[PDB]
Amino acid sequence: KDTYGFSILDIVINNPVNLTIHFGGEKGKRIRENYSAMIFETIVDGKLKTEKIFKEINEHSTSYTFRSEKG
């Protein structure tokens, strides 16, 4: 909850199809920064290739939605 604005207990108990994270206020902005920081580094032909997970999340994003089909 503190880091990524979602409860794992909630996901286990209710299994939602979609889950939206809202980056409003100071806490929302901190959570958004957490989302922005993480990356997917990889090695291509012996060279680092730093991608970014959540390319949709920038400093002008107000929310982000996790999606699925049945939960």
Binding site: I21, H22, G24, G25, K27, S63
Partner: peptide, 12 residues
């Protein structure tokens, strides 16, 4: 009250 009953703290 509606927002707090649902633990909504980041969508003012």
């Amino acid at each position: 009250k509606q927002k707090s009953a649902r633990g909504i703290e980041t969508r003012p």
